[PDB]
Amino acid sequence: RASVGSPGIPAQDLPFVIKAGYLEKRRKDHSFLGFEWQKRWCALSKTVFYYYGSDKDKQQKGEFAIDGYDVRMNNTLRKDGKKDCCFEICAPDKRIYQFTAASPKDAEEWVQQLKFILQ
């Protein structure tokens, strides 16, 4: 872990938000209670991607800088009728954040926005 954690910032207060919206993020955990894909309010503040339980939370569940990462649509992350709504953001250390959007267009807009930054 880091020596000093990321400051908690209310969702409403985030600066320089390029794009924001509800997505579902896939759980890492093999064994869990509830759904694999958990609803998260996501926001890209400059190059930092924040995620929250809701768009009114006072503190993020987590965040990461996208610098040096890659992004793609991925139609294999689920079998359900949402197969064409999923994309992932891949880090230099092969950590992956995997997301489902409300529609294929919504996912593609996220990817385009991120892809345009990752250069």
Give residues after which the chain gaps, C-N over 2.5 angstroms.
none
User: Long-range pairs for 54-60 at CB < 8 Å and ≥24 separation?
Assistant: 54/11, 55/11, 55/12, 55/20, 55/22, 56/11, 56/12, 57/10, 57/11, 58/8, 58/10, 58/11, 59/8, 59/9, 59/10, 60/6, 60/8, 60/9, 60/11
Method: X-ray
List C-alpha distances in Å: 12 to 1, 5, 46. Answer: 27, 20, 15
Q: Max CA-CA distance within the chain?
A: 42
Resolution, in Å, please? 1.9
Burial 11-28 (b: 16+ CB within 10 A, else e): beebeeeeebeebbbbee
Taken in order of first residue, the domains within the chain and their CATH numbers are 10-119 (2.30.29.30)
Structure tokens at 79: 């079998």
